[PDB]
């Protein structure tokens, strides 16, 4: 793959996407979840006492470039999962880019959900204002200051399991074979340390199901999570039924559904009918959109697997275009 190019693996039915990262000297390959909703780089380690037997664990003793650090860290994610441990320093190879002396967080403890998932840890791609330890420079910050990328961007392509899965992240460039037409520039609000954007409105057919709302571009979230009122309005448009747990039951047959279209900075971006169905379990389908009690939306994989995004940490801004498919 080209320089700074990282092929991704689509886990299950577009649940999450992970890529291989080499850490240490000579180095081991770790499968990390690429997460724009957080900014800590943490990995399962041999110090871990409740980690998955299947996870690849970083071993400080096997890296001649490991450097001890006296600080500890602890993280708690929106979904209730967590991890904690100690800081360390080592080299990280991201698609051929060798970041020297990156702060890595070695897990000592992790939630069972991590122990049983497919990744060895997370690579945070949010802003450095939300690192859990003050003063930690994120991988993007180091790519930029070490001159490893010449443009402060990363292009993201998330595939659909229905079409073969896959995905691809490119650090410092983007791939026009993955999208169609012109990219639309959208300003980002990073005041909360996230990739925040404003959606002008949402329509289903001729119905305006929502007026402007703010949301965050989160590659680390599976669904399109909307504020209660907006989710309810969307659900009414598709005849979806509330499961009372933040999710909806929708018809498994999407052949009749119209796409959920978002108007962003004057252009149309959609959630195609097939994406309206997240998962099918014993003939019952879970919708691709859910609800949460926040005033902002979490624009997750349901949306990102339909739209290519160039993330520019420099401005900050994003460039979006419908996926080529």
């Amino acid at each position: 793959a080209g320089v700074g190019t990282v092929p991704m693996t689509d886990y299950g039915n577009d649940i999450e996407y992970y890529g291989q990262v080499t850490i240490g000297t000579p180095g081991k390959k770790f499968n990390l979840d690429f997460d724009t909703g957080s900014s800590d780089l943490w990995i399962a380690s041999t110090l871990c006492t409740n980690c998955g037997s299947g996870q690849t664990k970083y071993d400080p003793n096997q890296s001649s470039t490991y450097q001890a650090d006296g600080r500890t860290w602890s993280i708690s994610y929106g979904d209730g999962s967590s991890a904690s441990g100690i800081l360390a320093k080592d080299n990280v190879n991201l698609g051929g880019l060798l970041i020297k002396g990156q702060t890595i967080e070695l897990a000592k403890r992790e939630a069972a959900s991590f122990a049983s998932g497919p990744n060895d840890g997370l690579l945070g791609l949010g802003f450095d204002t939300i690192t859990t330890v003050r003063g930690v420079k994120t991988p993007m910050d180091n790519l930029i200051s070490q001159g490893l990328i010449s443009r402060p961007i990363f292009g993201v392509y998330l595939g659909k399991a229905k079409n073969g899965g896959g995905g691809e992240y490119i650090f410092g460039g983007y791939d026009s074979t993955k999208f169609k037409g012109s990219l639309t520039t959208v300003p980002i609000d990073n005041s909360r340390g996230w990739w925040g954007i404003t959606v002008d409105r949402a329509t289903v057919g001729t119905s305006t199901v929502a007026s402007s709302f703010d949301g965050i571009l989160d590659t680390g979230t599976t669904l399109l999570i909307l504020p209660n009122n907006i989710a309810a309005s969307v659900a009414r448009a598709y005849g979806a039924s509330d499961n009372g747990d933040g999710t909806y039951t929708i018809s498994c047959d999407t052949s009749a559904f119209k796409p959920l279209v978002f108007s962003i900075n004057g252009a149309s971006f959609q959630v195609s009918p097939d994406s309206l169905v997240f998962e099918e379990f014993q003939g019952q389908c879970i919708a691709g959109f859910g609800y949460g009690n926040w005033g902002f939306a979490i624009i997750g994989d349901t949306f990102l697997k339909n739209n290519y995004v160039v993330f520019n940490q420099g401005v900050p801004e994003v460039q979006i275009a419908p996926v080529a498919e």
Partner: peptide, 7 residues
């Protein structure tokens, strides 16, 4: 489904 700080 996964949901990585605030969400």
């Amino acid at each position: 489904p996964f949901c990585x700080l605030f969400x």
